[PDB]
Every structure is written in structure tokens, then in C-alpha cells.
Design an enzyme around this catalytic site. Structure first.
Site, PDB file in Angstrom:
ATOM      1  N   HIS A 458       0.852  -1.215   0.000  1.00  0.00           N
ATOM      2  CA  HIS A 458       0.000   0.000   0.000  1.00  0.00           C
ATOM      3  C   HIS A 458       0.876   1.249   0.000  1.00  0.00           C
ATOM      4  O   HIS A 458       0.574   2.202   0.730  1.00  0.00           O
ATOM      5  CB  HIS A 458      -0.945  -0.033   1.190  1.00  0.00           C
ATOM      6  CG  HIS A 458      -1.862  -1.199   1.182  1.00  0.00           C
ATOM      7  ND1 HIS A 458      -2.793  -1.358   2.163  1.00  0.00           N
ATOM      8  CD2 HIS A 458      -2.011  -2.238   0.324  1.00  0.00           C
ATOM      9  CE1 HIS A 458      -3.488  -2.457   1.906  1.00  0.00           C
ATOM     10  NE2 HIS A 458      -2.995  -3.042   0.816  1.00  0.00           N
ATOM     11  N   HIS A 496      -6.949  -0.343   3.595  1.00  0.00           N
ATOM     12  CA  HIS A 496      -7.023  -0.902   2.225  1.00  0.00           C
ATOM     13  C   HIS A 496      -7.504   0.218   1.303  1.00  0.00           C
ATOM     14  O   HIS A 496      -8.699   0.513   1.233  1.00  0.00           O
ATOM     15  CB  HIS A 496      -7.904  -2.156   2.205  1.00  0.00           C
ATOM     16  CG  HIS A 496      -7.321  -3.313   2.943  1.00  0.00           C
ATOM     17  ND1 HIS A 496      -7.489  -3.490   4.312  1.00  0.00           N
ATOM     18  CD2 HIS A 496      -6.552  -4.341   2.505  1.00  0.00           C
ATOM     19  CE1 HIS A 496      -6.820  -4.574   4.673  1.00  0.00           C
ATOM     20  NE2 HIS A 496      -6.254  -5.116   3.571  1.00  0.00           N
TER      21      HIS A 496
HETATM   22  C1  FAD Z   1      -0.235  -7.205  -4.649  1.00  0.00           C
HETATM   23  C2  FAD Z   1      -1.059  -6.051  -4.122  1.00  0.00           C
HETATM   24  C3  FAD Z   1      -2.175  -6.283  -3.334  1.00  0.00           C
HETATM   25  C4  FAD Z   1      -2.984  -5.229  -2.859  1.00  0.00           C
HETATM   26  N1  FAD Z   1      -4.133  -5.548  -2.171  1.00  0.00           N
HETATM   27  C5  FAD Z   1      -4.952  -4.536  -1.894  1.00  0.00           C
HETATM   28  C6  FAD Z   1      -6.230  -4.812  -1.347  1.00  0.00           C
HETATM   29  O1  FAD Z   1      -6.685  -5.963  -1.256  1.00  0.00           O
HETATM   30  N2  FAD Z   1      -7.088  -3.744  -1.152  1.00  0.00           N
HETATM   31  C7  FAD Z   1      -6.687  -2.428  -1.291  1.00  0.00           C
HETATM   32  O2  FAD Z   1      -7.496  -1.546  -0.939  1.00  0.00           O
HETATM   33  N3  FAD Z   1      -5.438  -2.131  -1.733  1.00  0.00           N
HETATM   34  C8  FAD Z   1      -4.637  -3.134  -2.062  1.00  0.00           C
HETATM   35  N4  FAD Z   1      -3.421  -2.856  -2.612  1.00  0.00           N
HETATM   36  C9  FAD Z   1      -3.061  -1.435  -2.815  1.00  0.00           C
HETATM   37  C10 FAD Z   1      -3.869  -0.722  -3.899  1.00  0.00           C
HETATM   38  O3  FAD Z   1      -4.299  -1.669  -4.883  1.00  0.00           O
HETATM   39  C11 FAD Z   1      -3.005   0.361  -4.562  1.00  0.00           C
HETATM   40  O4  FAD Z   1      -2.433   1.258  -3.604  1.00  0.00           O
HETATM   41  C12 FAD Z   1      -3.764   1.208  -5.587  1.00  0.00           C
HETATM   42  O5  FAD Z   1      -4.378   0.278  -6.479  1.00  0.00           O
HETATM   43  C13 FAD Z   1      -2.831   2.153  -6.314  1.00  0.00           C
HETATM   44  O6  FAD Z   1      -3.533   2.853  -7.381  1.00  0.00           O
HETATM   45  P1  FAD Z   1      -2.755   3.843  -8.373  1.00  0.00           P
HETATM   46  O7  FAD Z   1      -3.782   4.399  -9.318  1.00  0.00           O
HETATM   47  O8  FAD Z   1      -1.892   4.751  -7.532  1.00  0.00           O
HETATM   48  O9  FAD Z   1      -1.752   2.917  -9.207  1.00  0.00           O
HETATM   49  P2  FAD Z   1      -2.019   1.774 -10.280  1.00  0.00           P
HETATM   50  O10 FAD Z   1      -3.371   1.160 -10.063  1.00  0.00           O
HETATM   51  O11 FAD Z   1      -0.810   0.881 -10.212  1.00  0.00           O
HETATM   52  O12 FAD Z   1      -2.098   2.524 -11.680  1.00  0.00           O
HETATM   53  C14 FAD Z   1      -0.959   3.064 -12.341  1.00  0.00           C
HETATM   54  C15 FAD Z   1      -1.006   2.650 -13.782  1.00  0.00           C
HETATM   55  O13 FAD Z   1      -0.040   3.439 -14.508  1.00  0.00           O
HETATM   56  C16 FAD Z   1       0.576   2.608 -15.468  1.00  0.00           C
HETATM   57  N5  FAD Z   1       1.805   3.267 -15.827  1.00  0.00           N
HETATM   58  C17 FAD Z   1       2.921   3.510 -15.006  1.00  0.00           C
HETATM   59  N6  FAD Z   1       3.838   4.246 -15.607  1.00  0.00           N
HETATM   60  C18 FAD Z   1       3.318   4.470 -16.877  1.00  0.00           C
HETATM   61  C19 FAD Z   1       3.830   5.173 -17.993  1.00  0.00           C
HETATM   62  N7  FAD Z   1       4.990   5.819 -17.998  1.00  0.00           N
HETATM   63  N8  FAD Z   1       3.066   5.209 -19.113  1.00  0.00           N
HETATM   64  C20 FAD Z   1       1.878   4.576 -19.092  1.00  0.00           C
HETATM   65  N9  FAD Z   1       1.294   3.890 -18.109  1.00  0.00           N
HETATM   66  C21 FAD Z   1       2.085   3.864 -17.024  1.00  0.00           C
HETATM   67  C22 FAD Z   1       0.706   1.269 -14.765  1.00  0.00           C
HETATM   68  O14 FAD Z   1       0.879   0.202 -15.673  1.00  0.00           O
HETATM   69  C23 FAD Z   1      -0.659   1.187 -14.059  1.00  0.00           C
HETATM   70  O15 FAD Z   1      -1.696   0.540 -14.812  1.00  0.00           O
HETATM   71  C24 FAD Z   1      -2.610  -3.886  -3.115  1.00  0.00           C
HETATM   72  C25 FAD Z   1      -1.425  -3.643  -3.839  1.00  0.00           C
HETATM   73  C26 FAD Z   1      -0.696  -4.709  -4.415  1.00  0.00           C
HETATM   74  C27 FAD Z   1       0.529  -4.429  -5.237  1.00  0.00           C
END
Ligand code: FAD
Ligand code: NAG
Ligand code: NAG
Ligand code: NAG
Ligand code: NAG
Ligand code: NAG
Ligand code: NAG
Length: 518
Positions: A458, A496
Site C-alpha cells: 500500500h 485498504h
Molecule cells: C499485490 C497487491 C495487493 C494489494 N491488495 C490490496 C487490497 O486488497 N485492497 C486495497 O485496498 N489495496 C490493495 N493494494 C493497494 C492498492 O491496490 C493500490 O495502492 C492502488 O491500487 C494504487 O492505485 P494507483 O492508481 O496509484 O496505481 P495503479 O493502479 O498501479 O495505476 C498506475 C497505472 O499506470 C501505469 N503506468 C505507469 N507508468 C506508466 C507510464 N509511464 N506510461 C503509461 N502507463 C504507465 C501502470 O501500468 C498502471 O496501470 C494492493 C497492492 C498490491 C501491489
């Protein structure tokens, strides 16, 4: 809870407006460009497309390419799978030496995660000092929940752990609730009761199919800029390595939704960030800001594994034990001979021979912070360096001690007593995979916390509101540029956070539109 989703197939209807980044006809002018089709990015792009022409760029492919991302049963497979640079799980190691993963797929981390759904601690809003429209926040949670969240059916192991938390004093009993509050509860899940994964990519189905375009295997390498400094567009490369440009027009904006790791990385490569650092890499500074890639956090995961002498049924996490100083859950997990990368913090960890209960505690905050810095000054496909400085702040260590003592109390409950190998008085009656809990002194708990820490996954920060962004998520000093993802806050919203970041993508989308309309 009228609003929640039903059991349903994963809805890929949005694929009708998904294209390979090799298609040069995606190049041109849009109202909005969203970088990263992830947790925040997908609902943001869908929301903006209600009124305006949007291009969503995601580096990964479509989840149909990796079927084990689409079921609860498949969760282990995705972490066991070797990272060939195309897989939905990208492996990394923090400079601390702790194995970790991030998503590389349309839907982002909601396509690979443990499915746990919760709303933000209601105190988080006032803590930020942002002027939230709290009625709109709640409508936005319901829009997400209607699409992808269910009330989970009972799972034997989750019910045991829930009875255990209550018996161990994690009170009160909150029954079924989506809310982050002190006590024990059943929360929502983005896995439906058939085990189908639902995720942020499904929120693209709420987009206007005449206004939204998605490019996949679109690796965004640079933000392009306009002496009135504005973002104007992006360069992206495709799976063949050819380069592409897209631009915003008029009162349109580029939003970076590339995650805690991807956002700061792209800002630094584009010349937004600390002046002496960038100038030391001969990167031309477009906008000096000392905080790009600073205040990066990973909440510690500490854990024990018990090996019951009779098999337990595997479960997805649905039951949470919340206090202000620790958040606790347990998964029950099938044995494997291929490790789940980052489940244990290094590749040298014992393999389980039988079903085991992974019993965990999460440190809130955390107060310890580190940074994202560039490994390559040119190549966005080369992962940046990330350091979390686990337990650099003594408050974090104090909180882990309290959490590990509470897991001690949990293993002493009548709830857990049937899972002991030996009917002896002490918790040495359990069989453990790896290190068991340690006497009447904090120092043994401190050593256990320090030595056995893993990532909770997270992680957050690197583009903080109040440091890089204003209260509207705008990059300070730059017009037509925002950041919306987990890079934006220095503390967790809850145990979460996917629920908060799904809500945040749409919410900031609605604030952009409301700003427009005036
Ligand atoms: C294994 C795991 C289990 C988890 N379990 C839970 C849970 O059960 N419940 C919960 O609430 N949270 C959970 N978390 C945490 C939560 O899912 C994340 O903190 C949250 O999804 C992050 O969202 P985000 O939009 O910041 O990033 P992301 O959802 O990772 O989105 C970022 C996106 O940007 C893309 N990207 C990156 N750089 C570039 C670029 N230069 N050009 C184009 N695309 C790019 C990536 O491919 C990705 O699709 C978990 C995390 C992980 C890793
Ligand atoms: C995009 O096209 C290339 C061929 O030019 C192919 O190798 C790649 O797999 C395609 N990607 C997707 C996501 O269809
Ligand atoms: C928002 O919903 C929560 C339940 O998650 C509730 O406690 C709160 O009172 C609601 N706030 C408003 C402004 O309605
Ligand atoms: C389902 O889940 C919990 C477990 O005790 C409880 O709310 C309910 O009584 C259960 N129903 C069953 C086992 O049919
Ligand atoms: C909720 O958030 C506030 C801090 O903003 C904190 O005081 C409280 O302890 C949190 N509660 C829980 C149970 O996490
Ligand atoms: C890049 O990462 C590697 C690990 O492959 C590290 O050991 C190396 O020194 C890093 N280079 C820079 C410039 O940070
Ligand atoms: C820990 O955290 C806070 C910053 O939030 C700081 O005030 C304190 O000095 C930090 N370090 C300690 C107490 O070791």
C-alpha cells in the site's frame, strides 16, 4: 448497501474503444490525456469522457491476455509468474532489500490485488485540510460500489479470524460495514461471490464510448510543455518501439495517474523536480520543485504463518481488525513450490508443504519516508530506484510492537485454539512457517519487527498535495497538469486504500468538469 454489485462476469464491453498504441490515428489533439489506466486513472478518464474527448494511455496490455488476473483463485499465479517485461506483475526490490510489485496492465493494481474494499476513515478528510465536497465523495463511493463491490459470502477461516479479533479485544463488533472504524468487521470485496475479479478497468464502461479512447502498450516517456508554463501533451512509444505524440487543446489538461512509482518517475524525466538533482543528470529543469519523488511511504507488513494439523479452506481477506495503531487481517493460503514474489520479503524463505494462515499486522502512516529517484535519465521502461527507510521513525517501530503483541493475543484465543498442532498452554503449540513471535520486554518484539518486515503493498507519496500539488491536484507552477493516484497523500486513507483511489479518480474528474463549466 442497496447499491452494491451482484455476482457477474467481468465486463470487457469497453474493449470496443481500446486500441494498440501502434495505431498512429490515436495521435492528435484531445481535451484530456490521462497517463496510466490504473486505479485512479480509469474512473478519471471515464468521468472526463462524459463531456470531453479523452485519451487514456496505459503501458500494459488488456487483462484478457492474462486470465489468472480475472479470478480470486488466480491471485497466486500472477505473483509466481516470472517478470518478462509484459506480465501484469512488475517485480522490484526497494533499496531497503524488500521485494515488492506494482501492476503493468489496464485496470492497474485493482487487476492484481487482494480485492479488499473499504471507504476512507471519515477523519481523513478534515486531517488533509482539503475543502472536500463530502456529499459528492459519498455519491462517488456508491458509483464505484454499484459497479464492482459485493458483500462477501461467509468463509470459514475469515469467520475464525473475526471471532479471534473480537475475543482478543478488537472491539466493537461492526458486523458488515465498508467503513474504516475501530473494531472487527466484514468489509466489501472486488472479488464477487463466484470468485470473479472486478476492477478499475470495468469503470471504463461508465465512459462515453464516442468520447473515450484507450491506447494499450503505450509507454509514456515525456510530458511536453509550452513564459506562462503549461503541459501541452506527451510522447509515448508502442510495443514495436516507435514514438507517438498526443496533445491537449484549449482549456484541456494532462493528468498523471501512473502510481506512486510511475508518476514521480515521469515528472523527473520531464524536468519537474529538484533543481540540483535534475541538473546533476543534465536534465533541463522545466519546473524546480524539491519534493518530486520525496515523501514516498510503504506501510510495514509484519506477520506469522501457522500450519494447522488439519487442512483449512483457502480464503480471500474480508475480515478486518482495526485499531488506530495497527490494522490486522489473515489470509488462508494453499501450499506451493513456486514462491509468490514479495509475499515474503526475500526469495530465501521456506516453502509451505500444507495450507497455512498468513496472519498480518499493518503499521499506520507510516511516519518513516524515503524517495523515488531515476535509475535511467532517459528510459521510462527502466524502473526507478525506490527506498522506503522502514522503521527509520521510532513511532512506526512502537506501533509494530503493539501490533505483534495483539497477534500474540489473537493466537491465545479459543477461536484459534483448534488450529494448534499440540494441545499445550502456550502459542508454541502452533506449528509455524518461518519466524514465530518471540518475553516480557519490548526489545525481542523490536528485533522481530525490524528483521521480518515485508511490504503491505500500500505504498503512497512522491507527488504530495501541499508539496508538489495544490488542493485541486494541480502541479504547482504548471497550467494544464494534475496528478491523481496514490502518489498524492503521505498517510493511508484506511487499511485498504483501493476504494479511496477509485473514488478519487472520478471525484477529481468531477472537480475538473465543475471548474471548466464556470
Ligand atoms: C499485490 C497487491 C495487493 C494489494 N491488495 C490490496 C487490497 O486488497 N485492497 C486495497 O485496498 N489495496 C490493495 N493494494 C493497494 C492498492 O491496490 C493500490 O495502492 C492502488 O491500487 C494504487 O492505485 P494507483 O492508481 O496509484 O496505481 P495503479 O493502479 O498501479 O495505476 C498506475 C497505472 O499506470 C501505469 N503506468 C505507469 N507508468 C506508466 C507510464 N509511464 N506510461 C503509461 N502507463 C504507465 C501502470 O501500468 C498502471 O496501470 C494492493 C497492492 C498490491 C501491489
Ligand atoms: C500491438 O501490435 C504489435 C505488432 O505491431 C504486437 O506485437 C503487439 O502484441 C500488439 N499489442 C496489443 C496489445 O495488441
Ligand atoms: C458519508 O458516508 C459515511 C459512511 O461511509 C457517513 O458516515 C458520513 O456521514 C457521510 N457524510 C456525508 C456528508 O453524508
Ligand atoms: C455467514 O457468515 C457469518 C458466519 O458466522 C454469519 O454472518 C452467518 O450466520 C453465516 N451463514 C451461514 C454459515 O450460512
Ligand atoms: C482515523 O483517522 C484519524 C487521524 O486522521 C486518527 O486519529 C484515527 O486514529 C483513525 N482511526 C483509525 C481507527 O484508524
Ligand atoms: C540502477 O539499478 C541498479 C540495479 O539494477 C543499481 O544497482 C544501479 O547502481 C542503479 N543505477 C543508478 C544510476 O541508480
Ligand atoms: C517521526 O515522525 C515525525 C514526523 O511526522 C517527526 O516529528 C519525528 O521527529 C520523527 N522521528 C522520530 C520521532 O524519530
Amino acid at each position: 448497501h442497496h447499491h452494491l454489485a451482484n455476482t457477474s462476469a467481468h465486463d470487457f464491453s469497453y474493449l470496443k474503444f481500446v486500441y494498440n498504441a501502434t495505431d498512429t490515428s490515436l495521435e492528435g489533439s484531445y481535451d484530456y490525456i490521462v497517463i496510466g489506466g490504473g486505479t485512479s486513472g480509469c474512473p478519471l478518464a471515464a468521468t472526463l469522457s462524459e463531456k470531453y474527448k479523452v485519451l487514456l494511455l496505459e503501458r500494459g496490455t488488456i487483462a484478457t491476455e492474462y486470465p489468472n488476473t480475472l479470478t480470486a483463485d488466480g491471485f497466486a499465479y500472477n505473483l509466481q509468474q516470472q517478470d518478462d517485461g509484459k506480465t501484469p506483475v512488475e517485480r522490484f526490490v526497494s533499496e531497503d532489500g524488500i521485494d515488492n510489485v506494482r501492476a503493468r496492465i489496464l485496470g492497474g493494481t485493482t487487476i492484481i490485488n487482494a480485492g479488499v474494499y473499504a471507504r476512507a476513515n471519515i477523519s481523513f478528510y478534515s486531517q488533509t485540510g482539503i475543502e472536500w465536497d463530502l456529499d459528492l465523495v459519498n455519491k462517488t463511493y456508491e458509483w464505484v460500489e454499484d459497479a464492482i463491490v459485493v458483500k462477501p459470502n461467509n468463509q470459514s477461516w475469515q469467520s475464525v479470524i473475526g471471532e479471534g479479533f473480537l475475543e482478543a479485544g478488537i472491539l466493537p463488533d461492526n458486523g458488515f460495514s465498508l467503513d474504516h472504524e475501530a473494531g472487527t468487521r466484514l468489509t466489501g470485496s472486488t472479488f464477487d461471490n463466484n470468485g470473479t475479479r472486478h476492477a478499475a478497468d470495468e469503470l471504463l464502461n461508465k465512459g462515453d464510448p464516442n468520447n473515450l479512447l484507450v491506447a494499450v502498450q503505450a509507454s509514456v516517456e515525456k510530458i511536453l510543455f509550452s513564459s506562462n508554463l503549461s503541459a501541452i501533451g506527451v510522447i509515448y512509444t508502442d510495443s514495436d518501439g516507435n514514438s507517438h505524440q498526443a496533445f491537449v487543446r484549449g482549456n484541456g489538461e494532462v493528468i498523471v495517474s501512473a502510481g506512486t512509482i510511475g508518476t514521480p518517475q515521469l515528472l523527473l524525466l520531464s524536468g519537474v523536480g529538484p533543481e540540483s538533482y535534475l541538473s546533476s543528470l543534465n536534465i533541463t529543469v522545466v519546473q524546480p520543485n524539491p519534493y518530486v519523488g520525496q515523501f514516498v511511504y510503504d506501510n510495514p507488513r509484519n506477520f506469522i504463518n501457522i500450519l494447522p494439523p488439519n487442512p483449512i479452506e483457502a480464503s480471500v481477506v474480508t475480515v478486518l481488525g482495526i485499531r488506530s495503531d495497527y490494522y490486522q487481517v489473515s489470509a488462508s493460503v494453499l501450499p506451493f513450490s513456486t514462491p509468490l514474489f514479495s509475499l515474503f520479503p526475500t526469495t530465501s524463505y521456506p516453502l509451505p508443504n500444507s495450507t497455512f494462515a498468513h496472519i498480518v499486522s499493518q503499521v499506520p502512516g507510516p511516519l518513516s519516508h524515503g524517495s523515488v529517484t531515476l535509475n535511467s535519465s532517459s528510459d521510462v521502461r527502466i524502473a526507478p530506484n525506490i527506498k522506503f527507510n522502514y522503521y527509520s521513525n521510532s513511532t512506526d517501530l512502537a506501533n509494530c510492537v503493539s501490533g505483534m503483541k495483539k497477534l500474540g493475543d489473537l493466537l491465545r484465543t479459543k477461536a484459534l485454539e483448534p488450529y494448534k498442532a499440540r494441545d499445550v498452554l502456550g502459542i508454541d503449540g502452533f506449528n509455524y512457517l518461518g519466524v514465530p513471535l518471540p518475553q516480557t520486554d519490548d526489545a525481542s518484539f523490536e528485533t522481530f519487527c525490524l528483521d521480518n518486515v515485508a511490504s503491505y503493498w500500500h505504498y503512497h507519496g512522491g507527488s504530495l498535495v501541499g508539496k508538489v500539488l495544490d488542493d485541486s491536484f494541480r502541479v504547482m507552477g504548471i497550467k494544464a497538469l494534475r496528478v491523481v493516484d496514490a502518489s498524492t497523500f503521505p498517510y493511508e486513507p484506511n487499511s485498504h486504500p483501493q476504494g479511496f483511489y477509485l473514488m478519487l479518480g472520478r471525484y477529481v474528474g468531477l472537480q475538473i468538469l465543475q471548474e471548466r463549466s464556470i
